């Protein structure tokens, strides 16, 4: 989901990744993945850069490179929520 | 330092019942007394019985540059302390030292008249610049009659002028205690760092002022539970208790101490110098208190008492909740950094299996409560425990650029009848057969002795069933430690020569509060 | 409660109630301690004369007592008992 996300970054200003909101198919090509499913170029449309979206991207970026742990992001460990409980 | 320091105090020393270079100690410029009563008192008795007239004696029975004194000898006989009562060479310097003293307190009676006193037995130069004499010196024809009534002979002067010896820090003593007195320099001046903090005595990290002032104690230490396992966790959660594994606080590293001294062993290394470091010593509860945060991780060390390898008193789960509650007292009393301490305590299952279930739950619940021997605690997550206090940053681990030292192993969590066998009754046996006898037994204390006697008789290190005779003595301790007879976990400390480091500061503890000590048994030899 | 509706005057009800309460109960604690139900026998809970335990009751009870009901744990005692193991 990385290198799936790092694909469709816009880059914008000096080189900076942007988060696109969403990706629409053109007019045209609404036909073809009618048929088709999920194999037509779509273009960036929406909020660029979606500041939602874009701060998780960042967010996981900084988790994922080792600046920030699971727990200092969730410091009240709701990441243990799906360990077995005994009754 | 500071028990060593209260302990000691009104006296200076064993010998000496007051002394006059505990001026410089309770004043300026180390100010070392924190505790009015304490310096009130210390001070006393040093201007009771060391104050005269042309300076103050260093101490009783004194025979430093004394008529009765034999210069050429470097040590003095028994019988010669004696005669150098009453003959005491007065100091003049420490006029300027009580008034300085003055000036720093802001009494200006006690500066004006200590002046009053040094201005006699100031000498002059040829130019008119004042001499501060180091001693005054009884003549060696006035000695009886100054025996006989102290101080009503004339003193001559060690120091003159004129003669080309000046006493130098008497003369920069004169120059400190003149630009007070005088006002050109302000006690803050010449004290920028407070050693000298009056009254409004608060908010001076390590100077016994915390945020409550000198009088108040009413600490509240952060105390985090951490249960060794999950299923610790699970089963403290089902009797009330809320406990935190050391996953569970994943950020957040919880060390022995012993990692904690491995990483202060870089703190102060120099090669070019040869300077190894911090020495190996074990962090306290102070120590410990602190929240450290070594290279980006945030550390936090349980206190020594929850240690299993120094001694085997923790074993017992008695010993150890006193053990907690006189960690807390003594934090209480002694911790007075801007910060609240934390005390992290640490929950084993050895603590807790078989009877041992019901005090340690005792010790919990008052924890719970908010109070325990007096001492206010706070029983929280470790997480927020740790939020906004001061951080002690180990930069030396990163300033040698020792970003890829070993990470620093933090805690893990876990995932019947009296002695058949008397000592004489095998021991007098001369024949070997007791080697089967080992296996003819039962008792545990049985094993402790027979392998002692093996790593005696057979060599230390020699093989075993289990393996070498060092390390099963080993397991044997740590197992006796477990199931608790404890004839055995004496016995494997005993043939080990196990020992723990509280120890020798204990001593420490006993012989400056005056108590000699002798560590030996009641009919043999006593050290 | 009885004041609310007619589904606690039910004794028989009580009990299928209590069973699936119970199951809700230690599949659903998330709290420190054990939790602590005190279940009151009200004259409404008695037999229509008035000197017997209702036999749907009267099976609960002792069901309790040996450690299982509605699929739960259950550790019988006094309320005097619970206080140090519960929230």
Same mark, same amino acid.
């Given at each position: 989901?990385?290198?799936?996300?790092?694909?469709?970054? /816009?880059?914008?200003?000096?080189?900076?990744?942007?988060?696109?909101?969403?990706?629409?198919?053109?007019?045209?090509?609404?036909?073809?993945?009618?048929?088709?499913?999920?194999?037509?170029?779509?273009?960036?449309?929406?909020?660029?850069?979606?500041?939602?979206?874009?701060?998780?991207?960042?967010?996981?970026?900084?988790?994922?490179?080792?600046?920030?742990?699971?727990?200092?992001?969730?410091?009240?460990?709701?990441?243990?929520?799906?360990?077995?409980?005994?009754? | 330092?500071?028990?060593?320091?209260?302990?000691?105090?009104?006296?200076?020393?064993?010998?000496?019942?007051?002394?006059?270079?505990?001026?410089?100690? =309770?004043?300026?410029? !180390?100010? !070392?007394?924190?505790?009015?009563?304490?310096?009130?008192?210390?001070?006393?008795?040093?201007?009771?019985?060391?104050?005269?007239?042309?300076?103050?004696?260093?101490?009783?029975?004194?025979?430093?540059?004394?008529?009765?004194?034999?210069?050429?000898?470097?040590?003095?006989?028994?019988?010669?302390?004696?005669?150098?009562?009453?003959?005491?060479?007065?100091?003049?310097?420490?006029?300027?030292?009580?008034?300085?003293?003055?000036?720093?307190?802001?009494?200006?009676?006690?500066?004006?008249?200590?002046?009053?006193?040094?201005?006699?037995?100031?000498?002059?130069?040829?130019?008119?610049?004042?001499?501060?004499?180091?001693?005054?010196?009884?003549?060696?024809?006035?000695?009886?009659?100054?025996?006989?009534?102290?101080?009503?002979?004339?003193?001559?002067?060690?120091?003159?002028?004129?003669?080309?010896?000046?006493? &130098?820090?008497?003369?920069?003593?004169?120059?400190?205690?003149?630009?007070?007195?005088?006002?050109?320099?302000?006690?803050?001046?010449?004290?920028?760092?407070?050693?000298?903090?009056?009254?409004?005595?608060?908010?001076?990290?390590?100077?016994?002022?915390?945020?409550?002032?000198?009088?108040?104690?009413?600490?509240?230490?952060?105390?985090? &539970?951490?249960?060794?396992?999950?299923?610790?966790?699970?089963?403290?959660?089902?009797?009330? $208790?809320?406990?935190?594994?050391?996953?569970?606080?994943?950020?957040?590293?919880?060390?022995?101490?012993?990692?904690?001294?491995?990483?202060?062993?870089?703190?102060?290394?120099?090669?070019?110098?040869?300077?190894?470091?911090?020495?190996?010593?074990?962090?306290?509860?102070?120590?410990?208190?602190?929240?450290?945060?070594?290279?980006?991780?945030?550390?936090?060390?349980?206190?020594?008492?929850?240690?299993?390898?120094?001694?085997?008193?923790?074993?017992?789960?008695?010993?150890? /909740?006193?053990?907690?509650?006189? !960690?807390?007292?003594?934090?209480?009393?002694?911790?007075?950094?801007?910060?609240? *301490?934390?005390?992290?305590?640490?929950?084993? @299952?050895?603590?807790?299996?078989?009877?041992?279930?019901?005090?340690?739950?005792?010790?919990?619940?008052?924890?719970?409560?908010?109070?325990?021997?007096?001492?206010?605690?706070?029983?929280?997550?470790?997480?927020?425990?740790?939020?906004?206090?001061?951080?002690?940053?180990?930069?030396?681990?990163? /300033?040698?650029?020792?970003?890829?030292?070993?990470?620093?192993?933090?805690?893990?969590?876990?995932?019947?009848?009296?002695?058949?066998?008397?000592?004489?009754?095998?021991?007098?046996? *001369?024949?070997?057969? =007791? &080697?089967?006898?080992?296996?003819?037994?039962?008792?545990?204390?049985?094993?402790?002795?027979?392998?002692?006697?093996?790593?005696?008789?057979?060599?230390?290190?020699? $093989?075993?069933?289990?393996?070498?005779?060092?390390?099963?003595?080993?397991?044997?301790?740590?197992?006796?430690?477990?199931?608790?007879?404890?004839?055995?976990?004496?016995?494997?400390? !005993?043939?080990?020569?196990?020992?723990?480091?509280?120890?020798?500061?204990?001593?420490?503890?006993?012989?400056?509060?005056?108590?000699?000590?002798?560590?030996?048994?009641?009919?043999?030899?006593?050290? | 409660?009885?004041?609310?509706?007619?589904?606690?005057?039910?004794?028989?009800? $009580?009990? @299928?109630?209590?069973?699936?309460?119970?199951?809700?109960?230690?599949?659903?604690?998330?709290?420190?301690?054990? *939790?602590?139900?005190?279940?009151?026998?009200?004259?409404?809970?008695?037999?229509?004369?008035?000197?017997?335990?209702?036999?749907?009751?009267?099976?609960?009870?002792?069901?309790?007592?040996?450690?299982?009901?509605?699929?739960?744990?259950?550790?019988?005692?006094?309320?005097?008992?619970?206080?140090?193991?519960?929230?």
């Amino acid at each position: 989901y990385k290198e799936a996300l790092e694909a469709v970054l /816009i880059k914008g200003k000096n080189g900076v990744p942007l988060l696109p909101e969403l990706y629409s198919v053109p007019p045209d090509r609404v036909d073809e993945e009618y048929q088709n499913p999920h194999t037509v170029d779509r273009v960036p449309m929406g909020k660029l850069p979606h500041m939602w979206g874009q701060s998780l991207y960042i967010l996981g970026s900084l988790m994922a490179e080792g600046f920030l742990a699971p727990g200092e992001i969730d410091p009240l460990n709701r990441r243990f929520s799906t360990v077995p409980k005994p009754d | 330092n500071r028990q060593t320091l209260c302990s000691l105090l009104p006296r200076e020393s064993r010998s000496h019942n007051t002394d006059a270079a505990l001026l410089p100690c =309770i004043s300026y410029p !180390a100010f !070392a007394l924190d505790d009015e009563v304490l310096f009130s008192q210390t001070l006393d008795k040093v201007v009771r019985k060391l104050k005269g007239k042309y300076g103050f004696k260093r101490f009783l029975r004194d025979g430093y540059r004394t008529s009765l004194e034999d210069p050429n000898r470097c040590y003095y006989k028994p019988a010669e302390i004696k005669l150098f009562d009453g003959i005491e060479c007065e100091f003049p310097i420490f006029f300027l030292y009580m008034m300085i003293d003055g000036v720093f307190r802001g009494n200006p009676k006690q500066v004006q008249e200590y002046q009053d006193l040094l201005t006699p037995v100031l000498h002059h130069t040829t130019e008119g610049y004042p001499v501060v004499p180091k001693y005054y010196y009884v003549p060696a024809d006035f000695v009886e009659y100054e025996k006989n009534n102290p101080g009503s002979q004339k003193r001559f002067p060690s120091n003159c002028g004129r003669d080309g010896k000046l006493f &130098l820090w008497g003369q920069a003593l004169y120059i400190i205690a003149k630009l007070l007195a005088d006002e050109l320099i302000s006690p803050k001046d010449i004290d920028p760092v407070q050693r000298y903090v009056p009254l409004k005595d608060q908010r001076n990290v390590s100077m016994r002022f915390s945020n409550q002032g000198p009088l108040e104690n009413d600490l509240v230490v952060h105390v985090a &539970l951490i249960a060794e396992s999950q299923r610790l966790q699970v089963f403290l959660n089902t009797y009330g $208790i809320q406990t935190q594994t050391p996953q569970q606080v994943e950020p957040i590293q919880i060390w022995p101490q012993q990692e904690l001294v491995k990483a202060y062993l870089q703190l102060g290394i120099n090669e070019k110098l040869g300077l190894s470091g911090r020495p190996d010593r074990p962090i306290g509860c102070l120590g410990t208190s602190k929240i450290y945060r070594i290279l980006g991780k945030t550390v936090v060390c349980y206190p020594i008492i929850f240690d299993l390898s120094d001694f085997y008193m923790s074993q017992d789960v008695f010993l150890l /909740i006193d053990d907690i509650k006189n !960690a807390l007292q003594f934090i209480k009393q002694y911790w007075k950094m801007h910060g609240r *301490p934390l005390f992290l305590v640490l929950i084993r @299952e050895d603590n807790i299996r078989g009877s041992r279930f019901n005090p340690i739950l005792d010790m919990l619940a008052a924890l719970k409560k908010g109070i325990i021997g007096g001492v206010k605690v706070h029983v929280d997550r470790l997480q927020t425990l740790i939020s906004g206090a001061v951080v002690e940053q180990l930069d030396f681990l990163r /300033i040698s650029d020792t970003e890829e030292l070993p990470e620093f192993k933090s805690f893990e969590e876990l995932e019947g009848q009296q002695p058949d066998v008397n000592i004489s009754e095998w021991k007098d046996k *001369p024949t070997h057969e =007791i &080697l089967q006898k080992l296996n003819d037994c039962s008792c545990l204390a049985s094993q402790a002795i027979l392998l002692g006697i093996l790593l005696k008789r057979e060599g230390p290190n020699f $093989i075993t069933k289990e393996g070498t005779v060092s390390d099963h003595i080993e397991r044997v301790y740590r197992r006796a430690g477990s199931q608790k007879l404890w004839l055995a976990v004496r016995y494997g400390a !005993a043939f080990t020569q196990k020992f723990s480091s509280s120890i020798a500061p204990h001593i420490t503890t006993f012989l400056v509060h005056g108590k000699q000590v002798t560590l030996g048994a009641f009919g043999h030899e006593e050290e | 409660d009885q004041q609310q509706f007619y589904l606690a005057l039910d004794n028989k009800m $009580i009990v @299928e109630m209590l069973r699936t309460d119970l199951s809700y109960l230690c599949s659903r604690w998330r709290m420190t301690g054990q *939790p602590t139900i005190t279940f009151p026998i009200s004259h409404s809970m008695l037999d229509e004369d008035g000197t017997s335990l209702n036999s749907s009751i009267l099976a609960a009870l002792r069901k309790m007592q040996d450690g299982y009901f509605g699929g739960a744990r259950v550790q019988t005692g006094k309320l005097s008992e619970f206080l140090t193991t519960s929230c």
